[PDB]
Design a protein around this ligand. Structure first.
Ligand SMILES: Nc1ncnc2c1ncn2[C@@H]1O[C@H](COP(=O)(O)CP(=O)(O)O)[C@@H](O)[C@H]1O
Ligand SMILES: [Mg+2]
Length: 447
């Protein structure tokens, strides 16, 4: 087992990772900005190192600072969490060059899947179905671009190859705007991601965001932990997730599970990963693979009883996967609400002192949050303050418990999106289930 892990992150995921280390008997090192000195997990950590000022670019994204924290503290491994340097291949390659273990896939695998054009192509070779589009990038050549779009069929979507966080995409409804829309997206992709390449996909009008959770040990073994539906989105940013995805063709799903697990073994995947799919009319279409732990890993943990982060850390310490697919039984249904410190109506982030925090509880209620009473949320980072996660015998039961949980949650002192969640879990279409990726904004929408 890994001697000592440095947690190269903050907030709730940092606390999540610390919990898993402690269960495994692993020594923890926390890194933090000057603005995050109040973070809950710092006091629970064995060692703590301030690695820069408030701005993320000068702290958490500062690779040299994180590597020096490991060297002084004698960390043997580094967990990147999600975001920041989790899918930064230079980070991975740098830490391994310095003789540390990375709790994630190989740097090359991060690059293979991080470039969304080569990822799609790797999935085609693995016989995993893909969203119809350009076979590779969309060329600047006007004649060729226009012919490709025509063959796919409008509407299409232009997507950044190096894209992330739902940014660098543009939808084109008729051919007269394709070239100028592509021109604009490449420019915007150039600044935001340092790669101006874009590709073309069919714009799917009624899909659901369904994704497959995998774990792979890098020694020939891989399993899935079912799927998740994450269709409720605002600006391509997920708000609620659930597992398993309800109302899915069982044959289609069972087929996609096999393909994904088989791909892990092909490409040599090591750690936790997620294949992201768009599901439409009984059929899956790959869009991307997240080569890290996900925000919404808990719903999958609820329905399988497999601890994804502990497995990650076991794999990283060099262990074979213990769990066989035989033993992975998806049971019940789980629901996650992302609790964000933002305005529930204007979505403007809401930093501040949490004068009083009270967490919901009871049967089938889990809470993952670094909040505590007296804690000040800083302005410098993402708006995620906690995740309320319910579990039941069925989807209706998970929904009933989220209502209850949401009723008891108090984050007094700042604004949250809690009232939005309260509406969503009473929304007729969502309570029915299987709403598409366009539903929330459409709903919001009517205003
Ligand atoms: N072909 C498509 N048609 C319609 N919506 C899409 C398409 N591709 C992506 N999206 C929307 O963008 C979201 C994220 O897509 P990704 O390809 O994962 C982009 P990112 O890497 O930023 O997450 C999806 O959940 C979906 O809502
Ligand atoms: Mg994505």
């Amino acid at each position: 087992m890994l001697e000592k892990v440095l947690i190269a992150n903050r907030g709730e995921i940092a606390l999540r990772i610390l919990r898993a280390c402690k269960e495994l008997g692993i020594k923890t090192v926390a890194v933090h900005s000057t603005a995050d000195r109040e973070l809950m997990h710092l006091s629970l950590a064995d060692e703590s190192v301030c690695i820069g000022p408030a701005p993320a670019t000068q702290s958490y994204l500062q690779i040299p600072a994180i590597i020096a924290a490991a060297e002084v503290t004698g960390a043997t491994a580094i967990h990147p969490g999600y975001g920041f340097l989790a899918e930064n291949a230079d980070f991975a390659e740098q830490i391994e060059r310095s003789g540390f273990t990375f709790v994630g896939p190989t740097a090359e695998v991060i690059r293979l899947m991080g470039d969304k054009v080569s990822a799609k192509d790797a999935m085609k070779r693995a016989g995993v179905p893909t969203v119809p589009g350009s076979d590779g990038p969309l060329p600047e050549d006007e004649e060729t671009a226009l012919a490709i779009a025509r063959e796919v069929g409008y509407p299409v979507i232009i997507k950044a190859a190096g894209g992330g966080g739902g940014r660098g995409m543009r939808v084109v409804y008729d051919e007269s705007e394709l070239i100028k829309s592509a021109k604009l997206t490449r420019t915007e992709a150039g600044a935001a991601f340092g790669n101006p390449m874009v590709y073309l996909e069919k714009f799917l009008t009624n899909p659901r965001h369904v994704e497959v959770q995998v774990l792979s040990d890098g020694q020939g073994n891989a399993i899935h932990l079912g799927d998740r539906d994450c269709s409720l989105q605002r600006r391509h940013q997920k708000v609620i997730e659930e597992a398993p995805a309800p109302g899915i063709d069982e044959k289609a799903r069972q087929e996609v599970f096999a393909r994904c697990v088989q791909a892990c073994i092909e490409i040599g995947y090591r750690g936790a990963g997620t294949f992201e799919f768009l599901y439409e009319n009984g059929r899956f279409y790959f869009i991307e693979m997240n080569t890290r732990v996900q925000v919404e890993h808990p719903v999958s943990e609820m329905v399988t009883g497999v601890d994804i982060v502990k497995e990650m850390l076991r794999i990283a310490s060099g262990e074979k996967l213990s769990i066989r697919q035989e033993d992975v039984v998806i049971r019940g249904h789980a629901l996650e609400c992302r609790i964000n410190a933002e305005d529930p109506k204007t979505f403007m982030p809401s930093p501040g002192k949490v004068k009083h925090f009270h967490a919901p509880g009871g049967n089938g209620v889990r809470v993952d949050s670094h909040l505590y009473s007296g804690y000040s949320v800083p302005p410098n980072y993402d708006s995620l303050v906690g995740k309320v996660i319910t579990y039941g015998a069925d989807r209706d039961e998970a929904l009933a418990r989220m209502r209850n949980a949401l009723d008891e949650l108090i984050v007094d002192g700042i604004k949250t999106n809690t009232e939005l969640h309260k509406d969503l879990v009473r929304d007729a279409a969502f309570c029915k289930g299987g709403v598409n990726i366009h539903y929330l904004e459409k709903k919001l929408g009517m205003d």
